[PDB]
Design a protein around this motif. Structure first.
Motif: not given
Ligand SMILES: Nc1ncnc2c1ncn2[C@@H]1O[C@H](C[C@@H](N)CC[C@H](N)C(=O)O)[C@@H](O)[C@H]1O
Ligand SMILES: Nc1ncnc2c1ncn2[C@@H]1O[C@H](C[C@@H](N)CC[C@H](N)C(=O)O)[C@@H](O)[C@H]1O
Lengths: 157, 157
Positions: A103, A107, A110, A122, A128-129, B157
């Motif tokens: 999952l 933005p 979860l 995991w 923050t990716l 964003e």
């Molecule tokens: N370091 C990470 N490890 C695991 N999952 C990640 C990680 N960073 C982001 N995610 C996943 O990416 C999702 C969020 C991303 N859409 C984040 C982008 C968000 N729009 C922001 O501006 O940073 C989270 O709900 C995680 O499920």
């Protein structure tokens, strides 16, 4: 007998370079361990929008797509598995035998229900990716893990 | 008084989609803080080759490229900076003013000399990442960190 690895993710229309990379890993998974993508519609953001209601809506669709699968959330505060550890987990998922739902939040992340439903969680990184790169990183790391299990040439560094 | 970020990477072949992604981020860095790539030719792994010697040769060249710069290695066992901390590091590097050399190892990883020369070490993940993704991650994460520092929209964003 076979285990599907299914990425349940929010968001649509990734950048082409991303779609391309993701596809390049995806098509290399063997038929006895197929890797697939299920996209959940992102909630319509906007001014005066109720974030919490939207997260809940996204979560309910994700939980509906996971069904009775093993549920593993990608979450920054999850387990920081290294590559050998991920190979072990993959073996674990195989022995378990249930298809695996991985999952990835939108933005805003979860929903609480999704975090509660997780059997494992995991962490790819402390960073923050952006969602598209998370998709590529999951595909590659699991492919590398798969290769270690089958003694395939890609992982020998 | 602009500050340079030099990615010192053991020279490798990049898939086109990775090259596109990498340039996309790279192109968006301001003139205030340029992002730069400097490949170091990878040694060939001949028959009967002594791997340790091969590695040293790869490193010496990296260090030659780093020069007087602040040396930061990309290494799995390094510091797992989150995005806030990475922005704080970015600020420290600026106060230093000194150019930063960000070192990425070849197929066999970094030379012991490179690991020793490091003022700081930076871990992207517990996972063993393929060289081309390491490049894209560094470019995007540094971009996100910078974005924070200037209140650029990308980070929020
Ligand atoms: N370091 C990470 N490890 C695991 N999952 C990640 C990680 N960073 C982001 N995610 C996943 O990416 C999702 C969020 C991303 N859409 C984040 C982008 C968000 N729009 C922001 O501006 O940073 C989270 O709900 C995680 O499920
Ligand atoms: N998780 C990571 N964090 C930071 N740098 C990384 C990471 N993964 C790979 N790299 C870089 O990519 C280079 C090549 C790696 N594939 C080497 C693998 C490493 N020697 C190992 O066996 O796990 C390494 O020298 C690092 O510079």
């Amino acid at each position: 007998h076979h285990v599907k690895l299914q990425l349940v993710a929010v968001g649509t229309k990734m950048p082409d370079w991303v779609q391309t990379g993701f596809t390049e890993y995806l098509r290399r998974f063997p038929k006895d361990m197929p890797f697939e993508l299920i996209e959940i519609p992102a909630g319509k953001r906007g001014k005066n929008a109720d974030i919490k209601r939207i997260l809940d809506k996204e979560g309910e669709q994700m939980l509906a797509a996971a069904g009775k699968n093993r549920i593993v959330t990608l979450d920054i505060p999850g387990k920081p598995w290294d590559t050998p550890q991920l190979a072990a987990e993959l073996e674990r998922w195989k022995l378990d035998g249930r298809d695996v739902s991985l999952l990835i939040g939108g933005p805003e992340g979860l929903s609480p229900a999704c975090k509660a439903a997780a059997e494992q969680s995991w962490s790819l990184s402390a960073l923050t990716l952006p969602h598209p790169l998370v998709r590529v990183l999951v595909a590659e790391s699991l492919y590398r893990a798969w290769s270690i299990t089958t003694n395939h040439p890609y992982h020998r560094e």
